[PDB]
């Protein structure tokens, strides 16, 4: 359950948290994938869906290799395959406070760098064989083309470039520069190619070279420097290169015993071998990427160790895309003419002049003297300067140090002793204020985050440059377009939008002070708006989510929450004979009541087969019910005609959780029940002659209990609310699992 | 009217 890991296996998989369900809000993940020194990392998104935003400013995935940085959201990374330039690939993921999608499933893979990005040092000793691997079977050859790129360090009279020895060990093909220079040794004969190349071309610049041969003519072909050459080696028409041999880089050549210090010194690249000898027309359509027919420059064909492989030859970033790159430098200079000049003008113009002598657009944007010490002569000071260099409009520090170190003569008597240059540090990722999570940023980048919690507009923060000691700092956030939880003003037109956003935040771990602000806004929303089903389904799950909060979080907000659910049920407009609104800890229901034919009613709360949410039976007592409410047939009997025409509906609520009904004046009695509510309108029917049968299931077992039937009286404890016993007695059907109440009011 | 059982 950890998403800040370092993954070191050869291949594997990782997902966003809770994939394939939705990720949680406010995530911050850092999967760093590390391979050893000769490998790169390839990732592949197997699946990807994030919350979309302009500039990916809500939820984003950043993919970081050694040279680039790119942010992704929406669906845009879904079929993608990305490749690290070094051996480390880092994948970040950040979600904000609301709106979650599915996330992602990424496969990672350690991939070796290709042999065609590597040159190979050939050895000086033996028992260091750099051979074609035994995965490859070298056929019988009566014709071949071999091409490679060769380059050298030192010179020697006898040196070998490749060696094919047979299954018994004696050499049968070798290209080696000899007593007579450049020669192809074939079978037992010597075919000199010296008129078309020799060892004066073992330059340290690489150059391609092709050698061809056929048995049938004896025709050696040489391709070098764009020109094709031909020569007949008539001795070579006797020989056939047999199967199953050992082809190796450098190697023994035309020697009987040893290869020990009998090899060329240098680099080789792109060694390939073919079954046929190529024409000059065929040798001119030969790119360096074409696969060799027997041996190709590709790691599956060779056993070459890592010790002999080198290498040669809107805004997309989540950090921001600034116009200028900034550097801070520390210059140590020696002035031998301290009383004459001001060295800051001379140093800054030398600084401006030196970068423009290498055609770089780097300029000084600020410089000041930090330390001045005389030395032995009183007119010679060592002066320490702090300077801001700015790179104008480019997509390394040690190169800036070396262009300055290679020009120490600043002015006459002015001399650079030391310089260090540091790239100016990014502003770190930082949460200020709470729910405003600002990502890491380059200097002068402004970042935008959503306004908590409605996200209608943005806030912004800028990573600024302190122009005194040339370090970066976060400026203050501009939250001027942002609204509080409380400060929005609800309308009929924005009520659906407000309720949806507050329903998102309430799944998260909220503070107790945020929770009473959500429940006050829900009360304003339920009061001003007209309520249909989809608006009430959002409001019931704000209240269901505050029911799984801590008991101290609910306690200040519970009476507003209870009163807002109560008025939502009075105001809800529905079309059928009944409407039920369910959630995890709260189901509320309305059904229509005919006051002419009212012969009584039984209503019931239950949870069905592999359902996690409770439902409402309006007609019967459902099987294994958690709450049953039976209304007597004489319920409307003592009602006036003015009251009986205000009776349209039956209301029913089942509270799966009890944290909204806390009572600290209970004499230590704990509430061991669900809470069920019922009513028939905006008024309470009192002093009935036949009671309401309220049966509620207990939370826990209690053998021979002493139950007290209570109702929630909103007038108790200075109009805050408490349980009240008045009117409610225990019926005779109560056991250890259920309690039946007969209450005389509803 | 919300109903509970105290024990
Ligand atoms: C990500 O993790 C790696 C290894 O734990 C660490 O070196 C790197 O600095 C981390 N970066 C961020 C931005 O968390
Ligand atoms: C590395 O990634 C790119 C996609 O950007 C892909 O085209 C390329 O083939 C990959 N490299 C290898 C060796 O497969
Ligand atoms: C260094 O270059 C900047 C870039 O235009 C310029 O404004 C500044 O005046 C130059 N400094 C000196 C001492 O000429
Ligand atoms: C919020 O920022 C995005 C870019 O990140 C921009 O497209 C949009 O116009 C901004 N909206 C407001 C209200 O500032
Ligand atoms: C606030 O709104 C104004 C006008 O709509 C806009 O110009 C400004 O950039 C916004 N501020 C932020 C931080 O988005
Ligand atoms: C110098 O840098 C430090 C940290 O980098 C910062 O706290 C301090 O305020 C800076 N000095 C000035 C004068 O701003
Ligand atoms: C947000 O709430 C605070 C709470 O004291 C209030 O003072 C402030 O005026 C509200 N914000 C706005 C922009 O009205
Ligand atoms: C709910 O009522 C509002 C107005 O009170 C109306 O605009 C909206 O279409 C209704 N929605 C549904 C799903 O009935
Ligand atoms: C019920 O009565 C109270 C005041 O007695 C009022 O605030 C509330 O809006 C009424 N309910 C409906 C649905 O009108
Ligand atoms: C209700 O009505 C019945 C019959 O009409 C009567 O006997 C009873 O006393 C009345 N009860 C109250 C509380 O008004
Ligand atoms: C209900 O009672 C039965 C025995 O009558 C018992 O097995 C069961 O555990 C009880 N259930 C609860 C939730 O107390
Ligand atoms: Ca989100």
Numbering used by the authors:
A (entry chain A): 39 to 351, 368 to 376, 400 to 472, 477 to 827
B (entry chain Q): 828 to 834
From the study:
Gpr126/Adgrg6 is one of the better studied aGPCRs and is essential for Schwann cell (SC) myelination and other functions. Gpr126 has a large ECR consisting of 839 aa. In this study, we determine the high-resolution crystal structure of the full-length ECR of zebrafish Gpr126, which reveals five domains, including a newly identified Sperm protein, Enterokinase and Agrin (SEA) domain, in which furin-mediated cleavage would occur in the human and mouse homologs. Intriguingly, the ECR is in an unexpected closed conformation that is reminiscent of the inactive closed conformation of the ECRs from EGFR and integrin families.
To determine the structure of the ECR of Gpr126, the full-length ECR (−ss) from zebrafish Gpr126 (T39-S837) was expressed and purified from insect cells using the baculovirus expression system. Zebrafish Gpr126 has high sequence identity (47%) to its human homolog but its ECR has a fewer number of N-linked glycosylation sites (15 predicted in zebrafish, 26 in human) and no furin-cleavage site, and thus yields a more homogeneous sample. Crystals of both native and selenomethionine (SeMet)-labeled zebrafish Gpr126 ECR (−ss) were obtained and diffracted to 2.4 Å, and the structure was determined by SeMet single-wavelength anomalous diffraction (SAD) phasing. The structure, with overall dimensions of 110 × 80 × 35 Å, revealed the presence of five domains, of which only four were identified previously. The 150 aa unknown region after the PTX domain was revealed to be a 22 aa linker that is partially disordered, the 23 aa alternatively spliced region (not present in crystal structure construct), and a structured domain which spans 105 aa and was identified as a SEA domain through the Dali server. Finally, the SEA domain is followed by the HormR and GAIN domains, the latter of which is autoproteolyzed as expected. Unexpectedly, the structure revealed a compact, closed conformation where the most N-terminal CUB domain interacts with the more C-terminal HormR and GAIN domains. As the closed conformation of Gpr126 (−ss) ECR was shown to exist both in solution and in the crystal lattice, we next wanted to explore the interactions that contribute to this protein architecture. Close examination of the crystal structure revealed two interaction sites that mediate the closed conformation, the first of which is a direct interaction between domains that are at opposite ends of the ECR and the second is an indirect interaction formed between two domains through a loop that holds them together. Residues in the HormR domain (H516, F533, P534, Y535) interact with each other through pi-pi stacking (sandwich), promoting interaction with F135 on the CUB domain through additional (T-shaped) pi-pi stacking to stabilize the CUB-HormR interaction.
